[PDB]
Amino acid sequence: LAMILYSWLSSKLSKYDIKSLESDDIEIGLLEEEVVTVLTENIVKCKNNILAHRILCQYYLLTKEYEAALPYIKNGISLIAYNIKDLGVHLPLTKREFSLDLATVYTYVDAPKDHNAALKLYDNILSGDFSNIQAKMGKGIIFIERKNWKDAMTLLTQVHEQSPNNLEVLSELSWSKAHMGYMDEALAGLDTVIKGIKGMDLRSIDFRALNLWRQAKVYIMKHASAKQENVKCAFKLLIQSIKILDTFAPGFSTLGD
């Protein structure tokens, strides 16, 4: 457990200052790819430990490896319910976090399947916090999925007001705004949302393409309401999308539309 917690404290995701904490010029350091391996090796030795599970789940979720998180969370909750029965220990905040994590996994894992449960869960924990962003963004995405924009917008605005740092929310909001009928703001929001990414990561490119495609869709929604021009702009954005991703069907579909 020591090794696990220290490993996390040393981790890049972690908000702690490892240099200050202990206070060709290659720093005698712990490799990030070693953090995870430490976690994995040592949690197997710490199995039946609550904290280790929590922390591992957090790490895996922070890296968008949701599929890996689900079992560690599921098991994690089991510990809490088992640990309370004999020891009589209570850790409410932890349980609430775990459940939250489960909700997110249910939100992303397979697209629409476990959303309905995620919602019940989000509400279940939201009842306490009310202000919570991570949950409202969840509900947001769920509602964006369910073509239920009137709520998606209102939630997404409130979570966006907390963090213009995050582009996912800004894009999802812009989308929720476009579908609502404030198309210009959406179109503009996406434009920031495209440049702001500035990544070539495998997970970044398709997202650039995604927003590129979204902008186009909205650009057609602009054509919904005599001008012949903007559709042509949509065509350009799509062409870009197809050009960048090369495996991006919706680009070809829309460009086909």
UniProtKB/Swiss-Prot annotation:
The superkingdom of the source organism is: Eukaryota
| UniProt-annotated location(s) | Cytoplasm; Nucleus
* Transmembrane segments annotated in the record for this chain: none
Q: Where are the TPR repeats?
A: 50-83, 96-132, 133-166
- Disulfide linkage: none
Subunit-structure text: Component of the SKI complex composed of at least SKI2, SKI3 and SKI8. The SKI complex interacts with SKI7, which makes the link between the SKI complex and the exosome in order to perform mRNA degradation.
Could you share any additional remarks the record makes about this protein? Present with 11900 molecules/cell in log phase SD medium.
Chain's role: Component of the SKI complex involved in 3'-mRNA degradation pathway. Represses dsRNA virus propagation by specifically blocking translation of viral mRNAs, perhaps recognizing the absence of CAP or poly(A). Essential for cell growth only in the presence of M1 replicon.
The UniProt similarity line reads: Belongs to the SKI3 family.
Q: Output this protein's name.
A: Superkiller protein 3
Q: Which organism is it from?
A: Saccharomyces cerevisiae (strain ATCC 204508 / S288c) (Baker's yeast)
Identify the taxonomic lineage of the organism of origin: Eukaryota, Fungi, Dikarya, Ascomycota, Saccharomycotina
UniProt gene name: SKI3
Entire-sequence positions represented here: 317 to 635 of 1432
